[PDB]
Structures are given as structure tokens and as C-alpha cells.
From a paper:
The viral nucleoprotein (NP), a key component of the replication machinery, packages the viral genome into protective ribonucleoprotein particles. This comprises a head and body domain between which is a positively charged groove, where single-stranded RNA binds. In addition, an oligomerisation loop inserts into a hydrophobic pocket in the neighbouring NP, the flexible hinges of which allow variable orientation of adjacent NPs.
The pseudo-C2 and pseudo-C5 oligomers appeared the most stable with uniform density according to local resolution, while the pseudo-C4 and pseudo-C6 structures displayed poorer density for 2 and 3 NPs, respectively. This enabled isolation and refinement of the most homogeneous sub-oligomers, corresponding to two NPs within each oligomer. Finally, 3D classification without alignments were performed to isolate the most homogeneous subset of particles, itself subjected to a final local refinement, resulting in four final maps enclosing 2 TiLV-NPs for each RNA-bound TiLV-NP oligomers (pseudo-C2/-C4/-C5/-C6).
Residue numbers in the entry:
A (entry chain E): 291 to 311
B (entry chain D): 34 to 350
C (entry chain C): 34 to 289, 316 to 350
RNA sequence: AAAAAAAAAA
RNA sequence: AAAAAAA
């Protein structure tokens, strides 16, 4: 089990999943 | 030599913990801050019971805590922190009595009690800051099960109500959700999930985190971001000579200049989640850059689009 | 020969603000309407306390409000409105006593109190409409931090509970969400974020927004939409000779690759026309065109 | 011709 | 910086 989220930070845009991008 | 907050935190930790308090270990400082936060919140055994509007279950829990024996001198705190026999004196002296309010003491007019209340507030603030930093540092290499979607991660860290009361701008959790959802007044502070917090070994000394300080990758990443932030922030670090474990800080990101790019549906049109990404269907959101202020000047680094927790473990293999 | 609804607001504003009330400035009218709404909701200093089921913190807040000195003649409300000595008399005689219900007054049969309650209701409705329009006008150049996702923007405007109670079909906020995200009755009104609200200077005189009446771009955009609506609506306005920040309305939207091809309908003087959507928020478009 | 009124009304 | 102030 693990997670691939990347929350928005420092003006970036949030990602629901790293792999799908 | 030091501000009032740092001096009072140093005095409290020293008095409570004797010489066992190591001033150059992040984990030790985090454990000491957690213990002092428990002490000043009457969450330890043998302290006053919070029963003002407590439910019968809350009443029973607090009463059981009160009846339970308080920690005995010499008890092991965390790993390398041992209580002294003179911690009870400090707990009885410098801890405001349960229900104490600043207005009442100001009406009383006793300067000593005003100073003690200000010291209590400052100690709560410092301990909460250290707790938040240790929360991020833990999140770097230990995911929190409570987080499964961007909405859940939006309120990180998840801390108690006292933490939110002391430092609203740094502490998330249920109370942060409650404050954000409700009306936002002038006193409301937005949850800055990635606001810069110097590591505990810097915060107590007051040495503001800056370029050139020798820090470990994990502690720096916790200072500037947390586990689920982008991996590009790893570019703010650079190993020193001989690899080792301690490197140096090369940049400090900036989290300003943020605006809205949504277009709600209206007059028969369809809602758009983002005007920029719309374009002609090109959903390639990897050109975004983070602004890093280096010694030479400000630069922009292209986002990697991967979690810090993932990258830290991957690159170590 | 204005309707009783607007006549009540005109008389109330006159009585409460003397000659300092200007009948041609949007900001002045919006501030006056906000003050009258606060006065008629028993939220000023020195007014009755809301203690039916208040919490301890709310109890203290209401008690402090009641004990606090009430506004005095000569106070400055906003920027160009000055309270007069007659405002106390109006507040005493025309504001229904806290907790007054229309049913009780109607049953009592007192014509004077029935008329007073009807005037109070009309004033509440007009003040809420002006408040919604001012919220839309403000949102064009300064968004709310709460609006960070489409779901959050779905509930604009974010006004107080009494505002929703007076005008359910125009006010969003938390209470609108609760009404939608919960049991719905027959007397249920659906939020219309783009309902055409004439500018206050046109609203308090009974004028209906139409084609051929001079207005400002921000005025029209607030009238027919808000900050995060698409920018194509800006095509409903046309600047006049020399600009000068004053133009004219040429149409009003209806129904108030392919995705960017969607068109809005504009009712022009000749006939309905289809205008391609721009895909950029009115706030963003105005920011870009500012310079 | 949805718009306006009267009944209701954290 | 200061002053307010619990699931």
C-alpha cells in the first residue's frame, strides 16, 4: 500500500495521482 | 540574547528535564516540546479535570485521569529524556490554573501573573510549532492512513484543538476545517500548509533558516514542505563534500502570487476547471515552476510531479 | 408613482441619512442599504439581544451588543453617509420589535402594525437585492479566498442567514447549501447566480435594466453575472464615444475544441445572437485588460 | 411574458 | 508586533 498524491504547493497545481499524469 | 519565547521555552525544558535534554537532537526537542505541551494543557495524569461542558464520557475520562497518579520523578520520556524531581514544582508554579483567562488576570493587576500567563501562551506557541514540524518530518517517511484524497491532505497536519488555538496559521485538523468552513472574519488565518518553520534545533536558538546552514535532507524537507508535497523541492538541498548525511541549504521556495483560474457554468455554458489547461485539449500540466530564492538570485525550477515520500525512498535504493 | 417597495426604502434612507444620502452613487446606496439591513435585523449596538437559544459565547456577544452604546447622530457610515437625529425615532417606530411574527400582527388586526411589518419585509427584500448586487460588483476585481474549487464557487454569493431568508432565490452561502443539501419543501427556491439585478441607482427608482441605458462595464457585469462567470458576457456592453468609463448596454444574456465552441445567447436590439464563449473568467479578463 | 405580488418564513 | 479567545 502507498499513495501518489501531490498536493498543490508554492504556486504549483495539485495532482490527484502521479502515475495518471 | 534571545527573544522571550525562546528563552522561556529553554528555561521550561531545562527545569523539567535536567541535563538529559539534548539541545542538538531534533527528536529530543520534539519529545520535550510534546511533553511540555501536554503539561501546559493539563493532559497529563493527576492534573485538573476539564468538565465545564464535558460529556459524561469526557467527564469519566477526565476524572479517571485526575484519579490516576501523576508521572513519577525519573520517568523515561520518549527515548533520551528523563524527568527530574523538580518538575512538579515548575508544573505547580508556571502552569496557569485550569480555566485561567488573560482578561481576568489583567483585571487582577498582578504583574507576576501577567508575566506567567504570557509565558504560558508563548510556550504553547513554541511547542505547537515544534509539533507541526515533527508532524511533517514524520510524514516524510511514514504516510498517515487518515489521508487518502487531496481533500484529506488539504488539512494536514491533524492536531488537537489546543494546537489550533495556539498557532492557527500552521495547524490543520478538524478545528481548521471548522474555522475555514464557517464565516471568515478579520482574525481568521488561512492554513499555511507549507509555511517555513525552522527545525527545532534552530527554532529554540532563534537562528532563522537560511542559505548555507548544514541540514539533513529530511529535516530541511520537513521545514519547507511535508511528505506529500512535490519532489522538486529536493532541489533546495545539495550534499556537501564526502556525501555523508548532512548537506547544505541552497534555496528557499516562495509561496506567493496565487490566483484563481476557474470559469463557472452560466447562461448555458459548461463549467471549466481551468482556463489554461483547457487550451485545445492539451492536459500537459508539467511546465509549472517553483520560484527558488538562491544567493545569486531568484530562479525557477520545473516541477517533477512526484511525491517527496516516493522520491526519498526511491533514490535511496 | 413608484411601488410601495421602493418608496419605503427611499423614505427610510431619507429619514435615517438626511441630505447626505446620494441617489446616484452605487457605493453610497449599497452602504446605506447595508446599514438599514443591519438596523432592521436588530444587529446594531444598543438593540435587542438574540437570546432564544444562543450559546454562551453567542450569549456574551448579544449581551455586549445590547449593552454597547447605540450609534449617535453625526456618525459616519461608509464614506459619504452621515446619521441624523431622526434615525433613533425611525429605529424605534418602524423596526418591528425583536421576534415579531407576521402571523401574530395579522391576528391582532392592528392595521398600523400590519402596514409596518409589510414595509419592513419590503425593505428587507430590497436591501438584500442591493447586497447581492454589491457582492457581485466586489467579486469582479477581488475574489474570495474560499472560492478555490468549482464546488465552492457553486454557492456564491456567501451572505448572512437573514439575507438568504429574505431572498432565497438570489443568495447563496452556507444556508443555501443546507437547503439544497437537505430536505426540500414545495416552497423551495433554486439559487440563480446570474439573476439580473438592476444597479442600485436603477433599482431604487424602479428603472428596469434594458438596452440603450448608460451604465459602466463593472456595473453591467455585476448586474448580469459575477467574477467567475465566463468573459463573453462583456460583449453585452459597448463603450461610448471617448470611453470615459461610461458606455451603453447593447444586450442582455438569455437563459440567466467543442467545449470552447459553446455559445451564449445575447438579446440585441435586432434579435437574439450567438456569441462564442471566451473561456476566461471575467475577473481574469478584467485583470488582463487593466493594463 | 421565467418576472412581480399576496399567503408561509451554523 | 500587539490586543481578543471548544467535537
Amino acid at each position: 500500500g502507498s499513495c501518489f498524491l501531490v498536493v498543490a504547493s508554492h504556486g504549483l497545481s495539485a495532482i490527484a495521482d502521479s502515475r495518471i499524469e | 540574547e534571545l527573544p522571550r519565547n525562546l528563552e522561556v521555552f529553554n528555561e521550561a525544558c531545562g527545569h523539567v528535564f535536567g541535563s538529559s535534554f539534548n539541545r542538538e537532537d531534533n527528536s529530543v526537542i520534539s519529545d520535550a516540546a510534546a511533553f511540555l505541551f501536554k503539561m501546559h494543557t493539563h493532559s497529563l495524569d493527576g492534573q485538573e479535570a476539564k468538565v465545564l461542558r464535558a460529556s459524561e464520557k469526557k467527564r469519566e475520562r477526565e476524572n479517571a485521569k485526575k484519579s490516576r497518579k501523576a508521572p513519577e520523578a525519573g520517568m523515561r520520556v520518549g527515548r533520551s529524556l528523563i524527568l527530574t524531581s523538580r518538575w512538579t514544582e515548575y508544573c505547580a508554579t508556571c502552569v496557569p490554573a485550569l480555566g485561567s483567562k488573560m482578561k481576568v488576570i489583567k483585571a487582577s493587576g498582578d504583574a507576576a501573573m501577567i508575566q506567567m500567563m504570557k509565558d504560558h501562551n508563548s510556550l504553547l506557541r513554541v511547542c505547537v510549532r515544534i509539533e507541526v514540524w515533527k508532524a511533517r518530518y514524520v510524514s516524510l517517511v511514514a504516510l498517515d492512513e487518515r489521508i487518502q484524497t487531496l481533500e484529506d491532505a488539504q488539512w494536514f497536519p491533524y492536531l488537537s484543538g489546543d494546537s489550533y488555538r495556539a498557532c492557527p496559521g500552521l495547524v490543520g485538523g478538524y478545528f481548521a476545517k471548522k474555522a475555514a468552513a464557517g464565516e471568515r472574519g478579520k482574525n481568521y488565518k488561512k492554513l499555511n500548509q507549507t509555511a517555513i518553520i525552522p527545525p527545532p534545533r534552530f527554532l529554540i536558538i532563534g537562528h532563522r533558516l537560511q542559505i548555507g546552514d548544514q541540514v539533513t535532507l529530511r529535516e530541511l524537507l520537513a521545514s519547507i514542505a511535508w511528505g506529500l508535497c512535490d519532489g522538486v523541492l529536493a532541489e533546495c538541498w545539495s550534499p556537501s563534500q564526502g556525501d555523508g548525511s548532512i548537506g547544505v541549504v541552497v534555496g528557499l521556495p516562495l509561496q506567493a502570487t496565487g490566483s484563481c483560474f476557474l470559469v463557472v457554468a452560466s447562461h448555458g455554458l459548461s463549467a471549466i476547471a481551468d482556463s489554461r489547461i483547457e487550451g485545445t485539449g492539451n492536459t500537459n500540466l508539467l511546465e509549472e515552476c517553483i520560484a527558488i530564492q538562491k544567493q545569486d538570485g531568484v530562479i525557477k525550477c520545473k516541477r517533477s510531479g512526484k511525491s517527496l515520500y516516493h522520491c526519498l525512498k526511491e533514490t535511496a535504493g
